[PDB]
């Protein structure tokens, strides 16, 4: 497991920035999904369950002003940066594993 920091800017205003940290890359990708699912939950408070296509989650990520992460590398004790498109791919891989 590599400690992972997620940097989030939902809109063009930097006043909305936040960050989160996770024990692994996988937990970070699970966290991105949870962030979207919380958005859907507040949009649909009366729905006990929601199904979405991965494309909807990717649309949501695309529409974020900024999303990136930083993955701890033990061999240099530094953080490797990865951008939105890298995150989306790791989410696809995660969800495919989860489905199986």
């Amino acid at each position: 497991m590599s400690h992972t920091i997620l940097l989030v800017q939902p809109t063009k205003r930097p006043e909305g920035r936040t960050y989160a940290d996770y024990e692994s890359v996988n937990e970070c990708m699970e966290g991105v999904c949870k962030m979207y699912e919380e958005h859907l939950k507040r949009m649909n408070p009366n729905s006990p369950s929601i199904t979405y296509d991965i494309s909807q989650l990717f649309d949501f990520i695309d529409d974020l002003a900024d999303l990136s992460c930083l993955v701890y590398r033990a061999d240099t004790q530094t953080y490797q940066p990865y951008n939105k498109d890298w995150i989306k791919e790791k989410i696809y891989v995660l969800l495919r594993r989860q489905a199986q």
Partner: peptide, 30 residues
């Protein structure tokens, strides 16, 4: 001997992006 310090479990932080907050629509009928 120093005192051992216990506290409640820290909840995992899950950001609420508040994307619907103050989102309004105005409709004119004229």
């Amino acid at each position: 001997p120093r005192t051992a310090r216990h506290a409640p479990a820290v909840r995992k932080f899950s950001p609420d992006l508040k994307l619907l907050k103050d989102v309004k629509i105005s409709v004119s009928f004229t």
